[PDB]
Design an enzyme around this catalytic site. Structure first.
Site, PDB file in Angstrom:
ATOM      1  N   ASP A  70      -5.936  -0.442  12.794  1.00  0.00           N
ATOM      2  CA  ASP A  70      -5.786  -0.670  14.232  1.00  0.00           C
ATOM      3  C   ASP A  70      -4.518  -0.011  14.757  1.00  0.00           C
ATOM      4  O   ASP A  70      -3.416  -0.301  14.299  1.00  0.00           O
ATOM      5  CB  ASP A  70      -5.725  -2.176  14.522  1.00  0.00           C
ATOM      6  CG  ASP A  70      -5.633  -2.481  16.007  1.00  0.00           C
ATOM      7  OD1 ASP A  70      -6.635  -2.254  16.720  1.00  0.00           O
ATOM      8  OD2 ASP A  70      -4.563  -2.943  16.465  1.00  0.00           O
TER       9      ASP A  70
ATOM     10  N   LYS B 208      -5.654   2.631  21.508  1.00  0.00           N
ATOM     11  CA  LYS B 208      -5.811   2.031  22.837  1.00  0.00           C
ATOM     12  C   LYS B 208      -5.096   2.763  23.968  1.00  0.00           C
ATOM     13  O   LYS B 208      -4.020   3.337  23.800  1.00  0.00           O
ATOM     14  CB  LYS B 208      -5.328   0.563  22.828  1.00  0.00           C
ATOM     15  CG  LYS B 208      -5.003  -0.012  21.442  1.00  0.00           C
ATOM     16  CD  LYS B 208      -5.431  -1.466  21.311  1.00  0.00           C
ATOM     17  CE  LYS B 208      -4.558  -2.240  20.329  1.00  0.00           C
ATOM     18  NZ  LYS B 208      -4.847  -1.916  18.912  1.00  0.00           N
TER      19      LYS B 208
ATOM     20  N   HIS C 175      -6.033  -1.163  26.695  1.00  0.00           N
ATOM     21  CA  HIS C 175      -5.098  -2.151  26.156  1.00  0.00           C
ATOM     22  C   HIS C 175      -4.967  -3.480  26.895  1.00  0.00           C
ATOM     23  O   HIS C 175      -4.995  -4.557  26.288  1.00  0.00           O
ATOM     24  CB  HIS C 175      -3.716  -1.520  26.014  1.00  0.00           C
ATOM     25  CG  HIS C 175      -2.964  -1.985  24.806  1.00  0.00           C
ATOM     26  ND1 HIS C 175      -2.228  -1.131  24.013  1.00  0.00           N
ATOM     27  CD2 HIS C 175      -2.820  -3.217  24.265  1.00  0.00           C
ATOM     28  CE1 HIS C 175      -1.661  -1.818  23.039  1.00  0.00           C
ATOM     29  NE2 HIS C 175      -2.005  -3.087  23.169  1.00  0.00           N
TER      30      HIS C 175
ATOM     31  N   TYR D 100       2.559   1.784  20.373  1.00  0.00           N
ATOM     32  CA  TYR D 100       3.306   1.368  19.183  1.00  0.00           C
ATOM     33  C   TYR D 100       4.299   2.449  18.757  1.00  0.00           C
ATOM     34  O   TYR D 100       5.208   2.212  17.954  1.00  0.00           O
ATOM     35  CB  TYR D 100       2.377   1.083  18.003  1.00  0.00           C
ATOM     36  CG  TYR D 100       1.395  -0.036  18.227  1.00  0.00           C
ATOM     37  CD1 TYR D 100       1.445  -0.811  19.381  1.00  0.00           C
ATOM     38  CD2 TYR D 100       0.361  -0.262  17.322  1.00  0.00           C
ATOM     39  CE1 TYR D 100       0.484  -1.774  19.636  1.00  0.00           C
ATOM     40  CE2 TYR D 100      -0.608  -1.224  17.566  1.00  0.00           C
ATOM     41  CZ  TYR D 100      -0.544  -1.976  18.729  1.00  0.00           C
ATOM     42  OH  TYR D 100      -1.520  -2.907  18.994  1.00  0.00           O
TER      43      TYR D 100
HETATM   44  N1  LIG Z   1      -4.518  -5.732  21.558  1.00  0.00           N
HETATM   45  C1  LIG Z   1      -3.349  -6.376  21.701  1.00  0.00           C
HETATM   46  O1  LIG Z   1      -2.793  -6.534  22.793  1.00  0.00           O
HETATM   47  C2  LIG Z   1      -2.637  -6.879  20.429  1.00  0.00           C
HETATM   48  C3  LIG Z   1      -1.591  -7.843  20.536  1.00  0.00           C
HETATM   49  C4  LIG Z   1      -0.750  -8.293  19.500  1.00  0.00           C
HETATM   50  C5  LIG Z   1      -1.060  -7.792  18.249  1.00  0.00           C
HETATM   51  N2  LIG Z   1      -2.097  -6.804  18.048  1.00  0.00           N
HETATM   52  C6  LIG Z   1      -2.498  -6.198  16.734  1.00  0.00           C
HETATM   53  O2  LIG Z   1      -2.689  -7.134  15.668  1.00  0.00           O
HETATM   54  C7  LIG Z   1      -1.874  -6.726  14.543  1.00  0.00           C
HETATM   55  C8  LIG Z   1      -1.354  -8.023  13.949  1.00  0.00           C
HETATM   56  O3  LIG Z   1      -0.647  -8.863  14.880  1.00  0.00           O
HETATM   57  P1  LIG Z   1       0.961  -9.029  14.903  1.00  0.00           P
HETATM   58  O4  LIG Z   1       1.705  -7.858  14.378  1.00  0.00           O
HETATM   59  O5  LIG Z   1       1.333  -9.514  16.246  1.00  0.00           O
HETATM   60  O6  LIG Z   1       1.111 -10.231  13.853  1.00  0.00           O
HETATM   61  P2  LIG Z   1       0.461 -10.844  12.510  1.00  0.00           P
HETATM   62  O7  LIG Z   1      -0.293  -9.929  11.619  1.00  0.00           O
HETATM   63  O8  LIG Z   1      -0.188 -12.113  12.911  1.00  0.00           O
HETATM   64  O9  LIG Z   1       1.848 -11.191  11.779  1.00  0.00           O
HETATM   65  C9  LIG Z   1       2.690 -10.172  11.225  1.00  0.00           C
HETATM   66  C10 LIG Z   1       3.787 -10.797  10.372  1.00  0.00           C
HETATM   67  O10 LIG Z   1       3.195 -11.479   9.239  1.00  0.00           O
HETATM   68  C11 LIG Z   1       3.814 -11.041   8.010  1.00  0.00           C
HETATM   69  N3  LIG Z   1       2.841 -11.127   6.880  1.00  0.00           N
HETATM   70  C12 LIG Z   1       1.738 -10.375   6.699  1.00  0.00           C
HETATM   71  N4  LIG Z   1       1.040 -10.723   5.619  1.00  0.00           N
HETATM   72  C13 LIG Z   1       1.738 -11.730   5.134  1.00  0.00           C
HETATM   73  C14 LIG Z   1       1.410 -12.469   3.992  1.00  0.00           C
HETATM   74  N5  LIG Z   1       0.306 -12.204   3.284  1.00  0.00           N
HETATM   75  N6  LIG Z   1       2.264 -13.484   3.668  1.00  0.00           N
HETATM   76  C15 LIG Z   1       3.360 -13.791   4.386  1.00  0.00           C
HETATM   77  N7  LIG Z   1       3.648 -13.056   5.478  1.00  0.00           N
HETATM   78  C16 LIG Z   1       2.865 -12.017   5.886  1.00  0.00           C
HETATM   79  C17 LIG Z   1       4.330  -9.634   8.323  1.00  0.00           C
HETATM   80  O11 LIG Z   1       5.433  -9.238   7.481  1.00  0.00           O
HETATM   81  P3  LIG Z   1       5.781  -7.741   6.965  1.00  0.00           P
HETATM   82  O12 LIG Z   1       5.124  -6.781   7.877  1.00  0.00           O
HETATM   83  O13 LIG Z   1       7.255  -7.693   7.071  1.00  0.00           O
HETATM   84  O14 LIG Z   1       5.221  -7.793   5.590  1.00  0.00           O
HETATM   85  C18 LIG Z   1       4.672  -9.716   9.804  1.00  0.00           C
HETATM   86  O15 LIG Z   1       6.019  -9.999  10.109  1.00  0.00           O
HETATM   87  C19 LIG Z   1      -0.817  -5.770  15.108  1.00  0.00           C
HETATM   88  O16 LIG Z   1       0.003  -4.974  14.251  1.00  0.00           O
HETATM   89  C20 LIG Z   1      -1.634  -5.061  16.164  1.00  0.00           C
HETATM   90  O17 LIG Z   1      -2.383  -3.969  15.589  1.00  0.00           O
HETATM   91  C21 LIG Z   1      -2.867  -6.340  19.151  1.00  0.00           C
HETATM   92  C1  LIG Z   2      11.525  -4.109  25.245  1.00  0.00           C
HETATM   93  C2  LIG Z   2      12.104  -4.515  23.911  1.00  0.00           C
HETATM   94  C3  LIG Z   2      13.170  -3.779  23.330  1.00  0.00           C
HETATM   95  C4  LIG Z   2      13.708  -4.167  22.079  1.00  0.00           C
HETATM   96  C5  LIG Z   2      13.185  -5.292  21.398  1.00  0.00           C
HETATM   97  C6  LIG Z   2      12.126  -6.033  21.966  1.00  0.00           C
HETATM   98  C7  LIG Z   2      11.573  -5.658  23.220  1.00  0.00           C
HETATM   99  C8  LIG Z   2      10.433  -6.518  23.757  1.00  0.00           C
HETATM  100  C9  LIG Z   2       9.048  -5.968  23.327  1.00  0.00           C
HETATM  101  O1  LIG Z   2       8.845  -5.517  22.188  1.00  0.00           O
HETATM  102  N1  LIG Z   2       8.124  -6.049  24.341  1.00  0.00           N
HETATM  103  C10 LIG Z   2       6.791  -5.730  24.182  1.00  0.00           C
HETATM  104  C11 LIG Z   2       6.400  -4.439  23.752  1.00  0.00           C
HETATM  105  C12 LIG Z   2       5.041  -4.107  23.589  1.00  0.00           C
HETATM  106  C13 LIG Z   2       4.713  -2.714  23.128  1.00  0.00           C
HETATM  107  C14 LIG Z   2       4.027  -5.095  23.867  1.00  0.00           C
HETATM  108  S1  LIG Z   2       2.270  -4.734  23.681  1.00  0.00           S
HETATM  109  O2  LIG Z   2       1.554  -5.118  24.870  1.00  0.00           O
HETATM  110  O3  LIG Z   2       2.061  -3.451  23.092  1.00  0.00           O
HETATM  111  N2  LIG Z   2       1.663  -5.803  22.498  1.00  0.00           N
HETATM  112  C15 LIG Z   2       0.278  -5.622  22.224  1.00  0.00           C
HETATM  113  C16 LIG Z   2       0.036  -4.851  20.928  1.00  0.00           C
HETATM  114  O4  LIG Z   2       0.586  -5.057  19.891  1.00  0.00           O
HETATM  115  O5  LIG Z   2      -0.902  -3.913  21.112  1.00  0.00           O
HETATM  116  C17 LIG Z   2       4.439  -6.401  24.304  1.00  0.00           C
HETATM  117  C18 LIG Z   2       3.433  -7.482  24.611  1.00  0.00           C
HETATM  118  C19 LIG Z   2       5.810  -6.697  24.456  1.00  0.00           C
END
Ligand SMILES: NC(=O)c1ccc[n+]([C@@H]2O[C@H](COP(=O)([O-])OP(=O)(O)OC[C@H]3O[C@@H](n4cnc5c(N)ncnc54)[C@H](OP(=O)(O)O)[C@@H]3O)[C@@H](O)[C@H]2O)c1
Ligand SMILES: Cc1ccccc1CC(=O)Nc1cc(C)c(S(=O)(=O)NCC(=O)O)c(C)c1
Length: 315
Positions: free
Chosen positions: A43, A77, A110, A48
């Site tokens: 993804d 996205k 997005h 990013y």
């Molecule tokens: N469409 C949208 O608007 C949207 C919004 C938010 C997120 N996303 C997507 O969803 C993905 C995941 O969400 P997210 O990054 O917000 O958070 P997430 O995957 O829920 O959490 C990430 C955190 O969990 C840790 N982690 C991963 N596996 C682990 C494990 N097995 N055990 C313990 N800790 C673990 C990671 O550490 P390390 O990386 O340090 O190992 C990281 O700090 C994103 O990278 C992005 O592609 C999309």
């Molecule tokens: C601006 C800034 C600077 C330094 C440290 C943190 C932040 C705050 C930040 O990171 N904001 C933010 C950036 C992005 C890039 C998204 S986002 O909308 O991209 N998240 C959805 C995804 O992961 O696709 C959101 C919600 C907040």
């Protein structure tokens, strides 16, 4: 199962690697490691700022015949500053060059909110409010449709759209292709039972993001709820001989949703993959669903006043 099927026929990997917050100098190797452990779904997103580094990992694995392009599911996205119709194709080409691919498997809008066009991804005003643009996401969608017509993307979908906004697209006169996916936040503290049900009834696959609560998010505060450090989940986690995370990943999968956990750590990238060997109790599933407190860790509060902010509505 191991994959779900989009209304176009395409098989979408039930699991994928998330890349938001994955440092450019670490994401190339995380992608490499994943493609090596079995991951076929990655993804991404222009916002990013690491698609180039992600593209290198894919290129190296694709060149070493390790994986065939056609067995790979790559998602990216369209960012908010690019919602204006004439700006959509450019943004898609940029992402294509950065990832070094000829086409995308899935391209999502997005957020339903469009921001004033520019180099700044979050154009704010003196009051710290994000400045909106003069576009409607229905016209942006029409441009997303041309992308399919030209073969630049295999399918198009939305992200963070509420059931009323999706409906606006579903009823658009002259609609060519309907949304195939709705990527939304889904974890124990936000089970989204209503939006998922609405989406499914419309033949739209749902991808759950931030399945672990995203403890690495910028705005996370010391007194913020923790899904990975919750005794209850740790409890059901312990009796399964798995980790909290491993169960938090199985939960959305058992609900028939696609999950994309994020990690740049190779050990966790592998542990995140160790979730196809077990199952959760119909009650265990119920115990988790009951922790719903409607708490979203991603609410873009700086957009709360945008005419298209999606979170003022029930679902
Ligand atoms: N469409 C949208 O608007 C949207 C919004 C938010 C997120 N996303 C997507 O969803 C993905 C995941 O969400 P997210 O990054 O917000 O958070 P997430 O995957 O829920 O959490 C990430 C955190 O969990 C840790 N982690 C991963 N596996 C682990 C494990 N097995 N055990 C313990 N800790 C673990 C990671 O550490 P390390 O990386 O340090 O190992 C990281 O700090 C994103 O990278 C992005 O592609 C999309
Ligand atoms: C601006 C800034 C600077 C330094 C440290 C943190 C932040 C705050 C930040 O990171 N904001 C933010 C950036 C992005 C890039 C998204 S986002 O909308 O991209 N998240 C959805 C995804 O992961 O696709 C959101 C919600 C907040």
């Amino acid at each position: 199962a191991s994959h779900l099927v989009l209304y176009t026929g395409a098989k979408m990997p039930i699991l994928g690697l998330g890349t938001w917050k994955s440092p450019p100098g670490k994401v190339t190797e995380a992608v490499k490691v994943a493609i090596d452990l079995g991951y076929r779904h990655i993804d991404c997103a222009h916002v990013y700022q690491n698609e180039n580094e992600v593209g290198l990992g894919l290129q190296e694995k694709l060149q070493g015949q390790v994986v065939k392009r056609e067995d790979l599911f790559i998602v990216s996205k369209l960012w908010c500053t690019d919602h204006e119709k004439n700006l959509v194709k450019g943004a898609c080409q940029t992402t294509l060059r950065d990832l070094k691919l000829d086409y995308l498997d899935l391209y999502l809008i997005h957020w339903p909110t469009g921001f004033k066009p520019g180099k700044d991804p979050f154009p704010l005003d003196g009051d710290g409010n994000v400045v909106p643009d003069e576009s409607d996401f229905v016209e942006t969608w029409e441009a997303m449709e041309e992308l399919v017509d030209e073969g630049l993307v295999k399918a198009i979908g939305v992200s963070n759209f509420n059931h009323l906004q999706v409906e606006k697209i579903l009823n658009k006169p002259g609609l060519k292709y309907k949304p195939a996916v709705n990527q939304i936040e889904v974890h124990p503290y936000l089970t989204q039972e209503k939006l998922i049900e609405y989406c499914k009834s419309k033949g739209i696959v749902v991808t759950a993001y931030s399945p672990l609560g995203s403890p690495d998010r910028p705005w996370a505060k010391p007194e913020d709820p923790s899904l990975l450090e919750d005794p209850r989940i740790k409890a059901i986690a312990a009796k399964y001989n798995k980790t909290t995370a491993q169960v938090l990943i199985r939960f959305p999968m058992q609900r028939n949703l696609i999950v994309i956990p994020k990690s740049v750590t190779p050990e966790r990238i592998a542990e995140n993959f160790q979730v196809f060997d077990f199952e959760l109790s119909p009650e265990d599933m119920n115990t988790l669903l009951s922790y719903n407190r409607n708490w979203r860790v991603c609410a873009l509060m700086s957009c709360a006043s945008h005419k298209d902010y999606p979170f003022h509505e029930e679902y």
